[PDB]
Amino acid sequence: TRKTYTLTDYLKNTYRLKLYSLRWISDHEYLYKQENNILVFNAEYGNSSVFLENSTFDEFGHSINDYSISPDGQFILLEYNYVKQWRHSYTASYDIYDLNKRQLITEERIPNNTQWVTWSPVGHKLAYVWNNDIYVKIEPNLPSYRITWTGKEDIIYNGITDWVYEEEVFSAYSALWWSPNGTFLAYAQFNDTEVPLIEYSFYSDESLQYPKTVRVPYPKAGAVNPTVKFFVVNTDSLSSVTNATSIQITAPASMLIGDHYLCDVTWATQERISLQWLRRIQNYSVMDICDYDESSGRWNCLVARQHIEMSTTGWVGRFRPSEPHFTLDGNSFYKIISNEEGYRHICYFQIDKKDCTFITKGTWEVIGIEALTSDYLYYISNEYKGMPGGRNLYKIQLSDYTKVTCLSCELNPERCQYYSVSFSKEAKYYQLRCSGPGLPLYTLHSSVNDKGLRVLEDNSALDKMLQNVQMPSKKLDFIILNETKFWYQMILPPHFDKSKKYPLLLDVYAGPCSQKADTVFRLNWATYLASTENIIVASFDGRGSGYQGDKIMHAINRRLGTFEVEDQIEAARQFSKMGFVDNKRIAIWGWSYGGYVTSMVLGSGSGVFKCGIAVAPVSRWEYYDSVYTERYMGLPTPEDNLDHYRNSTVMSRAENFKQVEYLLIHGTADDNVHFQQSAQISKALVDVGVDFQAMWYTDEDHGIASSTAHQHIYTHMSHFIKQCFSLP
Amino acid sequence: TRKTYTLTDYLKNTYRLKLYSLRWISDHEYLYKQENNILVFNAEYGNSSVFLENSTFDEFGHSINDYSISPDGQFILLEYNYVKQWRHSYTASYDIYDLNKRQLITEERIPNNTQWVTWSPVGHKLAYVWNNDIYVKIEPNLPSYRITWTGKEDIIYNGITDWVYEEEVFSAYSALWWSPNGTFLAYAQFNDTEVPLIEYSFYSDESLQYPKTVRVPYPKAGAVNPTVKFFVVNTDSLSSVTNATSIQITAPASMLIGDHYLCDVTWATQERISLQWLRRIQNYSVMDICDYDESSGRWNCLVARQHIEMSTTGWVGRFRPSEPHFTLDGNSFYKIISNEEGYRHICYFQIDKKDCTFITKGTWEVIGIEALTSDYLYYISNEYKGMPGGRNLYKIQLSDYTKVTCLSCELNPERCQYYSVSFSKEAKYYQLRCSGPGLPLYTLHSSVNDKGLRVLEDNSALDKMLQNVQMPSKKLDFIILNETKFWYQMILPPHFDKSKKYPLLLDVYAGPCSQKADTVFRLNWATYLASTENIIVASFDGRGSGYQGDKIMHAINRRLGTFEVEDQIEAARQFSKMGFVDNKRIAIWGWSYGGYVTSMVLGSGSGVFKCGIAVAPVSRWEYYDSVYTERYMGLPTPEDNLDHYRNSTVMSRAENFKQVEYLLIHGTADDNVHFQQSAQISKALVDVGVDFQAMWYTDEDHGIASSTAHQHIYTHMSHFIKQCFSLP
């Protein structure tokens, strides 16, 4: 008989999905690494040529982590000595290789322990951050110009983000932005001087006699936040005799009145930059549009070009105000904003006009704007078939908004319902990436007549292997709760039989603007649980979930740990009533926000769940970071929202855990959700005499992603679930 | 019929063991608390009176934690605001109450956060330590005199010990010693300037937003040790001079050549003090006897009065050099030292003669010297019936060493074999404290004729209760290995049937000079396991154990983690071959040194044990403190014992844990065995892919003794054991 998808298959990646990650280098060619050799492809015909031999660096001496070819293709940046920091940050050493003279540059090399590096968008200038300061190199072999001198570890950050800005605002370590042709280099400077530090132990190798104490500026809810300044420097007028002059662009008065954040930076033209600022109370944001003045050499932001964005029901943007997409001349722009019905759609703005015009509408949402030409704007939305968990590419005619054309919907409706896209330089070509419900499919297309040029990768090899495996199926459907439809998905065991009762595991995340019910194909722990253990793994998107309008998303505003937790209990209650579910064997598990919800659910006293697993959960909002927490909860002060901060903790529900089996897991070096959060949960449970299972992972962070720990946690959780379900 | 001793009975202390804690205030009167009242008893007739009514401090405004009456009975020290620190240390607030004028003193009060306070041995002077400096009050209501000005938190300690001296050398927080009539105050000063700090998080109450980092000067093996200095100040001159001089007494040249410790301070007469020093390599100790020179106001120590104590086979003393007991004139003293045969006996020394005379001998050992009069020396030994696990009080005639009388052996041989004693001020009366094998029994005796005056507490109430419970029985015996006997004890289930096969739990400690096989009566976890779960709980005293001569005790010298581990494994083999043990169900558990032995045993690959529980175990000796570790292991350097230090870790046996079920438990605030020790064990197990169970206890230290955590850990361990033995 055919085998099933086993835990080992998941842990050792027996069945790998093939990808096709290309890098556009112009409007008609892209780079693709094959056999460790970098090839250059012509999009039109599909022909290629070798761009760089894999042997080119046989005696390099170091293991190359990654590479980056300059925009003009004259040089290649080689990254090595990679050392990871937080989610996006890391340091590394770099070397530059001249592709023309086929030589490795040995003079004025980028320093070791460099924190970030980037070529200008055009040409081959380089900007890098080292020791928290910004340096610029006009030529790979020439000495660098020091741009800033205030860089100081854990205090002043120039051109790179501090912990909270990296994690919650920019989702990037870099805080540098080259103007379109590379003339100017804008950058932010963060000051964490008064930000309190989180401290935790790091044990390191067995050989370290005394544990190390890691200390990082981390503002918990309501604590002092870092401050921010924004500068722009002209890199075409740098001197090796005089220090570079950075021009500051100050935030508008409506922002300077109190705490605020810099949340977006987007160049509109060679001499016009837009900046969006957000108040610490995240329901008011301001976009400034500034023009360079050759006369004074300053940047002026006319008030007439200011655009305000606010929310009366919640915060601004999905996680942060959306980015503007400027037209060629920079006189107008398109941006996704919630309309009057609470659905996110594309609005068209005049830079000096207050009112914008919505170009799309309907009870669905635009996920993102992907390309803009003078005749069409391309975007991805979940409009097709009214499925919020599906994604397709559309283009809209800018001269007639009633002319909307779906470009991916009908390519292969049964195999492909969740698309992502990558356009070439001038949107002449685009790569479509289908990630579900069938196996991932990568295709190349031409924009002029939307021709389907060819298939880049169809994963036919994986398809052949999976035919010999008893794979689970996925059901995507919805339930009605108070006239509103909420979607859920179920990973069903092979040969599913509706006349039998299956144990059920509810997989939950449920953070604000999240989506767990979708059409994406995945090979993960749930695949194994369904395929080998015959467990149904369900996920449900309730109030607070995204992509279905603010009525649903903002339902949890100032109220985390309420509706989203109740909705997961309601879903399980519904599921428990279905004929194929064993109501005596229903469990729940989650990681991060999902660990919090799982814990809140288990301590709700609903009596629906037999057991649950919480991995690295938040336990009380006052322990989590300010930017994320305050966005949904406001401030933890008696005059604002302190009462709800105190009523939404896991600890307060400790006694309700007496009737469930609970497994609490957490990495000791978790810099994101501090171990402290689980330490307080266990202490509260010990205090009320409730027994439970626990597991700490020494020196693991929020991902508990090292190879050995990854295998161990899933192995441990599998034994727990099977034991809870009475499975061999 | 007849209930068993359940887990709840143990955790709720339903069967209360009564004791009789009295405080001698003179040669014939003692204080005893009865119904929150403090009574004063006349030893001779047993009649009493109310010394301090319970309603005396009903309006004190604070809960009085403890009290202390001045030697002259004129004042009472009231301790409150008790805040615990390490094993012996704590801070508190104090008030002094005038017993005569029955009035509480309100002027010149002892400061809050006082680290230590002690009355002079005579009268009512007081010496206290506050902010690491010593202060003396001649009168309770008068201002204090500052003795030191160097005190500095975590750096300089005057009159109090640092962490390592408290835990391993003195077993006490105080480092000051009043001379017999209170004229002089001697004290030690510790300097931890270069001692590395152990740092760990303390989460505290849920209300604390950021965890606190606890930092404690703690020397791990081979690290920089604190240095020490000794001083004596004449307190009688305090009111005559502005700043009384603290005369330093320096260690001898033999000690100053390298790192060393001050290990004992004992006043001999009003003007003679003895000090014992120990080299960092703990097999060489020196005792200096110093006399006050009234002409120079200095203290001189004549080399002819110096006594050397060294060891060729191990360290000096059981845990440290033994204390001297001086005759009244201070010209000679008695001290326990191991004889040529390796057994610890009492030796009689002339202060200026190097050769001593042994006054006791035999293949047994003297446990301690309890009292010394002009005619008799009283001591406790395990000579009776050749049982190293028994304890009796003996009296030897100082004028005729052949005249030795056992004062407790035959009092009640069946019920009493483990005695402890408490003599009145001049040894006129003594309280005997029998702690096993039967119920504890407390009695009063007159030394003049060694007649029993009366029974103070016989625990008849508890005996009445226990008759309604199926209690387990205890067996104490030995097995012969290599021609030498090794003792063990077994807690046997009620109605034990040698024809059946019972599951077996080996309870282990096994640290150097320890003893787990004794005649003490206990109501603990094992009582429950044997009584309700019908599990035999055994303990074995193999190589390294104490009170049986140096041949056995010093067998583990420079070799921890070898013979004592092997001997526990062999003990299990010998037990299984007794015929009433189920070879398929043998477990092992231990706390502290016992956790290390348990882990080493489970990782030996012996195949003898099915499962095991290690609580707060040591995992690698370089992580534990210098004083304890180096005493047995020497220094972790290539020139000394590094190889054995690297060969005796739990981590190197990770792979073998694949053969057993392991539960690892550790308190996160353990200042003694750092959580780091279990953090490295779990990491090594994850790295080799071994599954196991774990449990951390938030903010608990090495004793995991808070009421809720105590109940939770034993409940957790009971489930693990029951599951391992298939005991639903």
Ligand SMILES: *[C@@H]1O[C@H](CO)[C@@H](O[C@@H]2O[C@H](CO)[C@@H](O)[C@H](O)[C@H]2NC(C)=O)[C@H](O)[C@H]1NC(C)=O
């Ligand atoms: C990038 O754009 C900048 C700004 O438009 C160009 O710089 C200007 O060039 C003109 C000459 O054509 C000068 O008169 C201006 O003074 C320059 N402005 C500044 C701020 O320097 C620059 O030449 C462009 N670079 C490229 C490669 O096209």
Ligand SMILES: *[C@@H]1O[C@H](CO)[C@@H](O[C@@H]2O[C@H](CO)[C@@H](O)[C@H](O)[C@H]2NC(C)=O)[C@H](O)[C@H]1NC(C)=O
């Ligand atoms: C942004 O949200 C805040 C807080 O929800 C709003 O400010 C006030 O908040 C307090 C409670 O924190 C309420 O009592 C007030 O009624 C709220 N409004 C005002 C004007 O004080 C604020 O209004 C929101 N901003 C926008 C544009 O909706």
Ligand SMILES: *[C@@H]1O[C@H](CO)[C@@H](O[C@@H]2O[C@H](CO)[C@@H](O)[C@H](O)[C@H]2NC(C)=O)[C@H](O)[C@H]1NC(C)=O
């Ligand atoms: C215990 O009783 C004795 C004797 O009854 C008390 O000691 C004193 O004994 C002498 C002679 O017997 C009497 O003259 C005294 O009057 C007794 N003292 C007192 C204070 O009355 C002794 O006081 C009693 N001890 C206690 C603690 O109550």
Ligand SMILES: *[C@@H]1O[C@H](CO)[C@@H](O[C@@H]2O[C@H](CO)[C@@H](O)[C@H](O)[C@H]2NC(C)=O)[C@H](O)[C@H]1NC(C)=O
């Ligand atoms: C405690 O020991 C430290 C040495 O570890 C002493 O500190 C040194 O003192 C000398 C003399 O004043 C200075 O020159 C050095 O710079 C100090 N070294 C360090 C590391 O601080 C200190 O004096 C001792 N304290 C006492 C009260 O004895």
Ligand SMILES: *[C@@H]1O[C@H](CO)[C@@H](O[C@@H]2O[C@H](CO)[C@@H](O)[C@H](O)[C@H]2NC(C)=O)[C@H](O)[C@H]1NC(C)=O
């Ligand atoms: C009492 O005497 C001691 C010892 O001389 C004084 O302590 C010295 O104080 C000076 C000045 O502050 C320091 O330079 C020395 O290092 C200290 N030595 C010691 C051993 O502490 C103390 O200051 C005197 N107290 C008063 C009130 O004069």
Ligand SMILES: *[C@@H]1O[C@H](CO)[C@@H](O[C@@H]2O[C@H](CO)[C@@H](O)[C@H](O)[C@H]2NC(C)=O)[C@H](O)[C@H]1NC(C)=O
């Ligand atoms: C406590 O002992 C001390 C030390 O022997 C006594 O002080 C000595 O007293 C004699 C008088 O007999 C003097 O000659 C010495 O000068 C004192 N020496 C010192 C260092 O002070 C003291 O008298 C004794 N206390 C009591 C109450 O007897």
Ligand SMILES: *[C@@H]1O[C@H](CO)[C@@H](O[C@H]2O[C@H](CO)[C@@H](O)[C@H](O)[C@H]2NC(C)=O)[C@H](O)[C@H]1NC(C)=O
């Ligand atoms: C892809 O194929 C085209 C042929 O259509 C290649 O030809 C172009 O470039 C050649 C050299 O790069 C020239 O010799 C040809 O004249 C030119 N032809 C046309 C019609 O432009 C092209 O180079 C190939 N591209 C790659 C990446 O191999």
Ligand SMILES: *[C@@H]1O[C@H](CO)[C@@H](O[C@H]2O[C@H](CO)[C@@H](O)[C@H](O)[C@H]2NC(C)=O)[C@H](O)[C@H]1NC(C)=O
């Ligand atoms: C970073 O922000 C700090 C916080 O305001 C600035 O420091 C100011 O406040 C300090 C106390 O926190 C004081 O020492 C000074 O009055 C003041 N300036 C300095 C240098 O401390 C600090 O200047 C800012 N640094 C930069 C580079 O912007």
Ligand SMILES: *[C@H]1O[C@H](CO)[C@@H](O[C@@H]2O[C@H](CO)[C@@H](O)[C@H](O)[C@H]2NC(C)=O)[C@H](O)[C@H]1NC(C)=O
């Ligand atoms: C950054 O550090 C590297 C590594 O030390 C330096 O490169 C050389 O590394 C070799 C070992 O591979 C050493 O023997 C050399 O001493 C290092 N220095 C040199 C000049 O070769 C590198 O030089 C450092 N980079 C910078 C910009 O200082």
Ligand SMILES: N[C@@H](CC(=O)N1CCn2c(nnc2C(F)(F)F)C1)Cc1cc(F)c(F)cc1F
């Ligand atoms: N810290 C959160 C970050 C996040 O949700 N993304 C980062 C910011 N972001 C996202 N999507 N867009 C953006 C950005 F545009 F703002 F960058 C999602 C994730 C997160 C939430 C928790 F409750 C928790 F316990 C842990 C945790 F890691």
Ligand SMILES: N[C@@H](CC(=O)N1CCn2c(nnc2C(F)(F)F)C1)Cc1cc(F)c(F)cc1F
């Ligand atoms: N640190 C040890 C202290 C001790 O064993 N007593 C303290 C010193 N002592 C004793 N008996 N007499 C003395 C003294 F006289 F030296 F004070 C025993 C105990 C101990 C040993 C370990 F291996 C461990 F992992 C933890 C632990 F707490």
Ligand SMILES: *[C@@H]1O[C@H](CO)[C@@H](O)[C@H](O)[C@H]1NC(C)=O
């Ligand atoms: C590229 O290099 C790899 C080794 O890194 C080698 O196995 C492969 O054959 C090379 N590819 C080609 C096309 O030569």
Ligand SMILES: *[C@@H]1O[C@H](CO)[C@@H](O)[C@H](O)[C@H]1NC(C)=O
């Ligand atoms: C540039 O500024 C730094 C720091 O302010 C200063 O030390 C350096 O000398 C300056 N260089 C020049 C050329 O002015």
Ligand SMILES: *[C@@H]1O[C@H](CO)[C@@H](O)[C@H](O)[C@H]1NC(C)=O
């Ligand atoms: C509507 O349904 C929601 C949950 O979907 C529930 O909380 C609410 O009480 C219901 N009634 C109204 C008026 O919203």
Ligand SMILES: *[C@@H]1O[C@H](CO)[C@@H](O)[C@H](O)[C@H]1NC(C)=O
């Ligand atoms: C003393 O106080 C206790 C309270 O613990 C009370 O029960 C007892 O009766 C009191 N006895 C006297 C003599 O005051």
Ligand SMILES: *[C@@H]1O[C@H](CO)[C@@H](O)[C@H](O)[C@H]1NC(C)=O
């Ligand atoms: C101790 O502290 C308390 C509370 O702060 C204060 O009321 C009292 O006066 C202090 N006592 C002394 C002796 O300083």
